[PDB]
Amino acid sequence: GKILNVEKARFDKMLSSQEVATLITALGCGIGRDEYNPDKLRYHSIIIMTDADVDGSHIRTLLLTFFYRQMPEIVERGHVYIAQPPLYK
DNA sequence: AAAAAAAAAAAAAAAAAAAAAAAAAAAAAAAAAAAAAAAAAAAAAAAAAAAAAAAAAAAAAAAAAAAAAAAAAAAAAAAAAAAAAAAAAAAAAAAAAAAAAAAAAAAAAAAAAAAAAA
């Protein structure tokens, strides 16, 4: 579902299961900002495929905030992508 | 080779949790005024000291409020039953240092493979 707003949440508060899962799977080690190393990114194409409704847009904005604030080099290098599934058939 | 326990199939019973978004309150941790407390200067009312003095305890003795005796009568407090408040004694406990077992990196060297030379 929805994840923490890192702009509002404290750095120590970032100990949820979902952010830990994203940090482990990406393996950039975004936590700490001293073990962070974007060269060890396991996937060079990270795709934010949220639902087509407005809540999907909100979750997309939350993920964009997390990637921009915690992993600025990944966003700057252009590894982040956004999928566009259809709402209607 | 016998016993026992896990797990999985599918219709049933019953539960639990994480975040977003704004506005108000309540804990809980800090700077920072603000006043006690303490160290170290100079400074100044009190004891000392002395001579000089006169105000209240002694003493005579009456008398007038008194503390023991007598009586009647009212009924506060003490000790025995129960029923609550509030504190040491003793035992327990959750993190927390210590120990032991498994995952990841390491190169030495060779089997098998791929590739090419004459």
Q: What does this 3D model show about the protein?
A:
The protein has three helices and two strands, in the order αβααβ. Strands 1-2 form a two-stranded parallel ribbon. With 89 residues, it is mainly α. 8% of the residues are buried. The radius of gyration is 13 Å and the shape is globular. It binds one DNA strand of 118 nucleotides through helix 2.
Strand runs, count:
2
Helical fraction equals: 25-40%
Q: What shape does the CA trace take?
A: globular
What is the count of DSSP helices, taking H or I runs of 4+ residues?
3
SSE run: HEHHE
Question: How large a portion of the residues is in β-strands, by DSSP E?
Answer: 5-15%
Strand order of the largest sheet: 1-2
Largest sheet: 2 strands, parallel
Q: Structural class of the helix and strand makeup?
A: mainly alpha
First-to-last CA distance: 24 Å
Query: What is the radius of gyration computed over CA atoms, rounded to a whole number of angstroms?
Result: 13 Å
PDB class: isomerase
Keywords: DNA-protein complex, type IIA topoisomerase DNA gyrase, isomerase
Entry title: E. coli DNA gyrase bound to a DNA crossover
Name: DNA gyrase subunit B
Q: How would the blueprint of this fold be written?
A:
Layout: H1 17-26, E1 46-48, H2 54-70, H3 72-76, E2 80-82
Parallel strand pairs: 1-2
The protein binds one DNA strand of 118 nucleotides through residues 1-5, 8, 16-18, 55, 58-59, 62.
